[PDB]
């Protein structure tokens, strides 16, 4: 509630929180149920303050920075067990967040040798270790939300989209929703946002006097006993947990009819989108429809879910809002 605007991105984050239904298929395959979001935008656009919120509100979350990470630090590392004496494996960031989320910041500033590993985790959702006599496959099923910056300081509308983003196409294809956000100067927007920010900066915690510095120390008292409307965060956590663990909707024909018409309309048009449209857009519509169905606490996918998914993806790809 401390971020002004960015309604569609906040809807996408909520759809991430309630993931899609994973389908296990023959030939030893699985269709991924995770939603992966990338945000590219101008400096000071509240990209990094949403990753921090996702870190806190979600059940499991792992934070990563591009330049301060390595490939052996994301997948697994070979170490030794001092107590017994064998050689073993130690988990990395990606595998520690199984059935969780990974929030990566400064994603474009990551080295190429580092960026290949994340590719495999984004594709197979498994890690292969074949070092020092330890041949193992490790499970890593995590959702990725990432934030990056364009090649130049700010986004340029007079240049083609691929020139603005330094990331390769193979990596860029593995994200369900790419959001390009831009800061445009307008007096009414400035008057509203400045008022909101100035209102936020004038908040006093209960039990504190004016001019009293915040004593974020707890005085070594760790614990006392050792074991329009908005909703409070714990209630949201309960809602997300209940939805993830109690409802598994199934697809219906009348929703498929909307999905196919949206896909066919989107594919055959001359509009210049910020990202190419391919046969993997249909899977994105299906996943977003399943997530919206979970939000409604229902066991079937309806037409309204398809409409909401279509609107979200049209905003993401086109900006037609």
């Amino acid at each position: 509630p401390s971020i002004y605007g960015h309604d569609h991105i906040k809807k996408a984050i909520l759809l991430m929180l309630m993931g899609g239904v994973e389908k296990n298929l023959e030939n030893g395959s699985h269709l991924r149920g995770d939603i992966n979001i990338l945000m590219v935008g101008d400096p000071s656009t509240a990209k990094s303050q949403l990753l921090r919120f996702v870190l806190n509100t979600a059940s499991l979350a792992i934070a990563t920075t591009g330049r301060g990470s390595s490939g052996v630090g994301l997948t697994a590392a070979v170490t030794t067990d001092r107590e017994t004496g064998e050689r073993r494996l130690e988990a990395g960031a990606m595998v520690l967040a199984d059935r969780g989320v990974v929030c990566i910041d400064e994603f474009d500033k990551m080295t190429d040798v580092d960026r290949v590993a994340i590719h495999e985790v984004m594709e197979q959702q498994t890690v292969t270790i074949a070092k020092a006599g330890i041949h193992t496959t490790l499970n890593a099923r995590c959702s990725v939300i990432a934030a990056a910056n364009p090649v130049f300081g700010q986004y340029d509308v007079n240049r083609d989209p691929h020139q603005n983003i330094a990331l390769p196409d193979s990596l860029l294809s593995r994200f369900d929703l790419l959001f390009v956000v831009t800061d445009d100067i307008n007096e009414i927007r400035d008057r509203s946002i400045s008022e909101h920010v100035l209102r936020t900066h004038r908040y006093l915690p209960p039990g504190y006097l004016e001019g009293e510095p915040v004593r974020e120390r707890l005085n070594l008292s760790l614990a006392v006993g050792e074991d329009p409307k908005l909703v409070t965060i714990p209630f949201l956590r309960k809602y997300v947990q209940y939805a993830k663990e109690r409802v598994i909707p199934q697809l219906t024909q009348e929703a498929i009819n909307v999905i196919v018409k949206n896909y066919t309309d989107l594919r055959n048009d001359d509009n210049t989108k910020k990202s190419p449209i391919t046969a993997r857009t249909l899977e994105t519509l299906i996943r977003l429809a399943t997530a919206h169905a979970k939000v409604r606490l229902s066991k079937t996918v309806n037409k309204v879910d398809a409409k909401v998914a279509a609107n979200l993806l049209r905003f993401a790809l086109l900006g037609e809002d």
């Binding site: 298929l25 190419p276 249909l282």
Partner: protein, 222 residues
């Protein structure tokens, strides 16, 4: 002494995915296998040559995205012309947007998600163990050729070369035909003969092989 994957698959298929990003160090082995199929080994004082007869199935990714109205196929991918010439067949599958095809593709994909079973159709899926049994039995078979059949191959090749001398154009085709094309024509007729036939090869077999090669060649526009 540890052999590579190329050596490991003898009389088998090597499926090289993402061949664009693979380094020149492996390009050396790929170059040498297609030439002599005998891998020379590392320099750790053993001087060993290992049999590596294998077939290659490569998947490629064009440079910076999709097909480009840049005319040269050499411009689309990084692969050298010499490396591509040794390949028996090249297939271009370009994604062209067509309103009819997208509807059937979407319906086919969504039927699998609604019901896990594949969409029932008049087409019958043959049992895979029968696939393996027939493939192995065909592999064990040994064809043979006749002098009359190969006479028409010379006429086919001279017609192809007389086309290739003028086929050099702005956009279509990759260079000119080489005797390796004649060799690959017979090599592909081998498999089409082994498929159902035996002993001498039929004349229409050469026509089928030529048709498949010509469709692959015409895939450059499509």
């Amino acid at each position: 002494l540890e052999g590579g994957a190329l050596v490991l698959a003898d009389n088998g298929i090597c499926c090289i995915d993402e061949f664009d990003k693979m380094d020149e160090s492996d390009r050396t082995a790929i170059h040498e296998v297609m030439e002599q199929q005998t891998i020379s080994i590392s320099k750790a004082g053993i001087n060993t040559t290992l049999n590596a007869r294998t077939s290659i199935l490569a998947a490629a990714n064009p440079l910076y995205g999709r097909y480009n109205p840049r005319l040269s196929p050499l411009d689309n991918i990084n692969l050298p012309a010499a490396l591509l010439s040794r390949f028996d067949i090249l297939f271009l599958m370009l994604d062209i947007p067509s309103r009819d095809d997208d509807e059937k593709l979407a319906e086919h994909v969504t039927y699998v998600h609604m019901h896990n079973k594949q969409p029932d159709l008049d087409f019958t899926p043959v049992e895979p163990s029968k696939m393996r049994e027939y493939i192995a039995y065909a592999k064990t078979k040994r064809p043979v050729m006749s002098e009359a059949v190969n006479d028409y191959v010379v006429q086919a090749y001279i017609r192809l070369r007389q086309d290739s001398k003028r086929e050099m154009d702005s956009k279509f085709s990759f260079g000119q035909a080489t005797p390796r094309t004649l060799l690959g024509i017979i090599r592909l007729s081998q498999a089409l003969a082994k498929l159902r036939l035996a002993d001498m090869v039929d004349i229409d077999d050469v026509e089928e092989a030529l048709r498949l090669v010509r469709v692959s060649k015409e895939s450059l526009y499509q």
